[PDB]
Design a protein around this ligand. Structure first.
Ligand code: SRO
Lengths: 50, 219, 230, 333, 283
């Protein structure tokens, strides 16, 4: 009954090219790489787990 | 070195550990049973008789053994996403109504399908099943004027109860594809105050003894 | 709430039995402390008993002389006194405590009971014994200790208490940075090792009293001389 | 009014195909690969007896809660392995638990449809139920806090509900899923949340508007786990097909499939690293796998469990990863 | 002839290989390590391996070289080690029987939890400490020789044999006490425990054979292995030590093969252990 209205609402939304999404995703990932202790292990002193 | 507050926290943690261990020791002493069956299979009747919008827990004790049952019938949701929670149940109590062989949801076929799906489930390979045939008196009353052939085409026998019920139970037990690992304790639900719980206790004690023997390697 | 009983006049060298009844909380899970105040001096630690009676400590000035025991079923705490001496003349407090990450020990203090007898610890100093204050003014209190209270784990084990005239002490700040539950935001605390201070913004009514500092790095627990605001 | 739905779906598919100019693998082909990420069990937490099904990290990144069929929730001090509280549950059949962002409250639930909110900061010391939310017809699946008063829940009723704790009644009833909802995830801004269900589709919802904004598909079986990218633009989903899929809300298209020919088991938990480079998914084959979210290549294996990796979580600071299993043990890496 | 010597070597090789396989199977399989009862089999097989690598090769040397080149002290050390390890294996079997009895008859519901570390430690430490009081303390001090010193002196350098050889003659008190402690009391305990096991299995299969076969096989193996040695030991101090040395050696070895058979009886015949065995074989 009401499914057609939901599909109509979902159809009208704007969409960006996948290339822009990938570029933004990679940029965000690269920008915060300096602050990830799992991506790059930290020395024992900084690590709260010893 | 730990500080005074740290030492107090460690003492509190050890006290919590002791309490958890005591509660677990209490928990291991009581059997866990799973109750299953069709909507009108008579689960309410049997659960009320044995008792001396989700899971319903019933606690009762018989001859100094703690029993609790889990009624999962109220859950109108997909089984495979939560059935694995009951992997540790000592046994499964299954209820099927004999009188439903001539009532349309073919409800006997639905019960057989559910039995096949539960007993052959990978999560219940080692768990035993206790099967109760409910409403035996009604089946006695109605069978003599309604041949069993209406439900099972390949039947070959008379309409008398003594062999009709035998054929029903044989069909229920024949669905077990893991006869070597598990057993089907079939019984008939007669109105009573103690015999049903007596049979359940006998089944559970026998099952636990067999499990212990298997663990020790003697079986 | 906690209420003490068993006080009164006692001859020197005798024995008196003090007790208090806990209600309104899980007494079993909470530790208990006994703190006494002389008629004209500051607070002094006496004894401590942990939950489940798994750990008991006494102050050197009462070692052996005093005994502390618990009874969870009746939610009552006990303290046995024997061979009293004139120095024991003081009014005693029951202090509630729980120890876990984020907890606030010494949060609740009982009404207290008065006992009259016929007649390497961490030193902490509060040189500013008294300060005249005016309502609406911002005032600060300073404290010092011999041993640094900044443990290697990062927690600075110092507590601040306020005792109003004729009223039991109330926890104000714990661990030098955390305000106790129900404390107005006016109060604040900060300080490096071996030096601590407490600040009050726009002091107002019922703020006059004696402010007591307390260390909890290691037993015995030592209280300060107190700072009086008038 | 019963035939145009397929035409609209075809139009949506065409629109989604139009924006598929390039794939993430092609664009990221030139990045420096992460390399082998070796992790060792720094702490192992013991004290649970039955299976552990759920865990969550506090905002402080030091306290975590874990649920088990013992009927008890244990608040764990990860730094010292100490136990802070032991909450005896009314119903032992718990399947989910959550830790409030302020740390004052803890929630849990399961086959018993009632969702119980527990107050930790009790003046009397002992923890007690603050409220017992009810109204879900089916079993409770996942629970997550938005604040000290609002909690979002999913259940087997095929519906997700937003609850106002102070009044103890549903503020909104999200509906539209065709199958049981298996997991939930809240966006960093708390404006939106995404739910996965057994209908092999993931739907994006608006907390305040109360209707589905977007629906995603591509899995061939039930979606058992789901989690946002920490930037809030993309989310990952886990399914029984052994395949992890990354979805972007703005692009409205599937980006990558993380699967290997040697993996046949299902996926029970999924989580992201703070930077988002590392995707951690708890598989049912006795170990957890580390996937590079930008390369799709496997970077490591956290094999330290014996029964089943049931829950997985990363600290808000990213310092450590917590993995629970049906061994009744929790391991912090 | 060489035929016997190679037969010994085959027995020792088989026993050592079986015991080592049992060790590695238990160490590798996590599913086995989680069960309390499995620890007892580990200690039993370890005692069997000690018997294998410290006892039977020495006997192989003895039956061929016919000269105890190692001297008086090492003969005493050999006797003490052999007695200690044999009684340790017997006590391990008896305690396994008692553990099965407890689990299957007394507290079947909470058996696994009630196996606290303290009780298993008590049993295992007993299995190794009780043998010492009969194997080292009385043997080292020579308490077994008092009252029969003349016979030992004659036997050591009989007119029939110019070459020295090991002799372990035992006197009335040591004979009776040590035999009763090592074999008869454990045998009676095992018999009672397994009879009660069988009674429980027959009774609780009622209320409406495999265990019978397993128990019969185990008990028959134990009796065939150890009964002749102890009856010979008890009888000889009463018949003036007349049994020939060949029969003594045959019975002593019949006890020795018990070490190589135990892995089959208690590890290979268990449904859980064959999983670890297959895993080890595949490697
Ligand atoms: N070779 C087995 C030695 C041994 C074990 N137990 C014994 C008991 C009595 C005895 O004379 C000798 C023994």
């Amino acid at each position: 009954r009401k499914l057609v209205e939901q599909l109509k609402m979902e159809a009208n939304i704007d969409r960006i090219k996948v290339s822009k999404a990938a570029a933004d995703l990679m940029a965000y990932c690269e920008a915060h790489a300096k602050e990830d202790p799992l991506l790059t292990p930290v020395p024992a002193s900084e690590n709260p787990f010893r | 070195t730990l500080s005074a507050e740290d030492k107090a926290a460690v003492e509190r943690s050890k006290m919590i550990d002791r309490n958890l261990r005591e509660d677990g020791e209490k928990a291991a002493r009581e059997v866990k049973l799973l109750l299953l069956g069709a909507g009108e299979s008579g689960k309410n009747t049997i659960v009320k008789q044995m008792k001396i919008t989700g899971i319903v827990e019933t606690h009762f004790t018989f001859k100094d053994l703690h029993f609790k049952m889990f009624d999962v019938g109220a859950q109108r949701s997909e089984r495979k996403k939560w059935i694995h929670c009951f992997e540790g149940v000592t046994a499964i109590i299954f209820c099927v109504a004999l009188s439903d062989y001539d009532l349309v949801l073919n409800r006997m076929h639905a019960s057989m399908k559910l039995f096949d799906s539960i007993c052959n489930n990978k999560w219940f390979t080692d768990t035993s099943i206790i099967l109760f045939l409910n409403k035996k008196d009604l089946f006695e009353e109605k069978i003599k004027k309604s041949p069993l052939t209406i439900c099972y085409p390949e039947y070959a026998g008379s309409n008398t109860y003594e062999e009709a019920a035998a054929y029903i139970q044989c069909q229920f037990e024949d669905l077990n594809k893991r006869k070597d690992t598990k057993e089907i304790y079939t019984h008939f639900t007669c109105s009573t105050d103690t015999k049903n719980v007596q049979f359940v206790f006998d089944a559970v004690t026998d099952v636990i003894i067999k499990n212990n023997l298997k663990d020790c390697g003697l079986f | 709430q906690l209420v003490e009983s068993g006080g009164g006049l006692v001859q020197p060298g005798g024995s008196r039995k003090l007790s208090c009844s806990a209600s309104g909380f899980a007494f079993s899970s909470f530790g208990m402390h006994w703190v006494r105040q002389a008629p004209e001096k500051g607070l002094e630690w006496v004894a401590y008993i942990s939950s489940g009676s798994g750990t008991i400590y006494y102050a050197d000035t009462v070692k052996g002389r005093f005994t502390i025991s618990r009874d969870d079923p009746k939610n009552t705490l006990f303290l046995q006194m024997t061979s009293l001496r004139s120095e024991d003349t003081a009014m005693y407090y029951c202090v509630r405590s729980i120890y876990y990450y984020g907890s606030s020990p010494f949060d609740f203090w009982g009404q207290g009971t008065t006992l009259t007898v016929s007649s390497s610890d961490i030193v902490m100093t509060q040189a500013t014994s008294s300060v005249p204050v005016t309502p609406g003014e911002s005032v600060s209190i300073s404290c010092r200790s011999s041993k640094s209270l900044l443990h290697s784990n990062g927690n600075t084990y110092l507590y601040w208490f306020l005792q109003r005239p004729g009223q039991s002490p109330q926890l104000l700040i714990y661990r030098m940075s955390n305000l106790a539950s129900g404390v107005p935001d006016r109060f604040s605390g900060s300080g490096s090792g071996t030096a601590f201070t407490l600040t009050i913004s726009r002091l107002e009514a019922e703020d006059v009293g004696v402010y007591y500092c307390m260390q909890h790095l290691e037993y015995p627990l030592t209280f300060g001389a107190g700072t009086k605001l008038e | 009014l019963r035939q145009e739905a397929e035409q609209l779906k075809n139009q949506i598919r065409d629109a989604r195909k139009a924006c598929a100019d390039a794939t993430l693998s092609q664009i990221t082909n030139n990045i420096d690969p992460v390399g082998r990420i070796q992790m060792r069990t720094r702490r192992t937490l013991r004290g649970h007896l039955a299976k552990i099904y759920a865990m969550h990290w506090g905002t402080d990144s030091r306290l975590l809660v874990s649920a088990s069929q013992d009927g008890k929730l244990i608040i764990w001090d990860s730094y010292t392995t100490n136990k802070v509280h032991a909450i005896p549950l009314r119903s032992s059949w718990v399947m989910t638990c959550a830790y409030a962002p302020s740390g004052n409250y803890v929630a849990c639930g399961g086959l018993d449809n009632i969702c119980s909110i527990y107050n930790l900061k009790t003046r009397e010391g002992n923890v007690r139920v603050s409220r017992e939310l009810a109204g879900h017809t089916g079993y409770l699946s996942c629970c997550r806090f938005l604040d000290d008063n609002q909690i979002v829940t999913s259940s087997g009723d095929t519906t997700c509900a937003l609850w106002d704790i102070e009044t103890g009644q549903q503020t909104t009833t999200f509906t539209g899923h065709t199958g049981d909802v298996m997991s939930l995830s809240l966006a960093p801004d708390t404006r939106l949340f995404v739910s996965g269900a057994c209908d092999a589709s993931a739907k994006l919802w608006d907390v305040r508007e109360g209707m589905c904004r977007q629906t995603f598909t591509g899995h061939e079986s039930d979606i058992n786990a789901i989690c946002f990218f920490p930037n809030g633009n993309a989310f990952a989903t886990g399914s029984d097909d052994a395949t992890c899929r990354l979805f972007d809300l703005r692009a409205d298209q599937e980006l990558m499939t993380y699967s290997h020919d040697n993996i046949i088991c299902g996926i029970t938990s999924v989580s992201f690293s703070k930077s988002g480079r590392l995707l951690l998914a708890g598989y049912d084959d006795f170990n957890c796998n580390v996937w590079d979210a930008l390369k799709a290549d496997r970077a490591g294996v956290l094999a330290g469990h014996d029964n089943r990796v049931s829950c997985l979580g990363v600290t808000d600071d990213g310092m450590a990863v917590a993995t629970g299993s049906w061994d009744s043990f929790l391991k912090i890496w | 002839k060489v035929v016997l010597l190679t037969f010994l070597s085959t027995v020792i090789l088989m026993a050592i290989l079986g015991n080592l396989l049992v060790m590695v199977a238990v160490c590798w399989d996590r599913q086995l390590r989680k069960i309390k009862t499995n620890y007892f089999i580990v200690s039993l097989a370890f005692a069997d391996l000690l018997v294998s690598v410290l006892v039977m090769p020495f006997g192989a040397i003895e039956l061929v070289q016919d000269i105890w080149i190692y001297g008086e002290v090492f003969c005493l050390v050999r006797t003490s080690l052999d007695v200690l390890l044999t009684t340790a294996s017997i006590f391990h079997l008896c305690c396994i029987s008692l553990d099965r009895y407890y689990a299957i008859c007394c507290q079947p519901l909470v058996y696994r939890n009630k196996m606290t570390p303290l009780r298993i430690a008590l049993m295992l430490g007993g299995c190794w400490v009780i043998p010492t009081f009969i194997s080292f303390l009385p043997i080292m001090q020579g308490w077994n020789n008092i009252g029969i010193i003349d016979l030992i002196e004659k036997r050591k350098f009989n007119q029939n044999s110019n070459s020295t050889y090991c002799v372990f003659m035992v006197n009335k008190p040591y004979a009776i006490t040590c035999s009763v402690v090592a074999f008869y009391i454990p045998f009676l305990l095992m018999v009672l425990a397994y009879y009660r096991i069988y009674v429980t299995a027959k009774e609780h299969a009622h209320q409406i054979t495999k265990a019978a076969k397993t128990l019969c096989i185990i008990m028959g193996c134990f009796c065939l292995c150890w009964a002749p040695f102890f009856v010979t030991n008890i009888v000889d101090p009463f018949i003036d030590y007349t049994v020939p040395g060949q029969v003594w050696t045959a019975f002593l070895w019949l006890g020795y093969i018990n070490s190589g058979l135990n892995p089959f009886l208690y590890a290979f015949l268990n449904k859980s252990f064959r999983r670890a065995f297959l895993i080890i074989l595949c490697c």
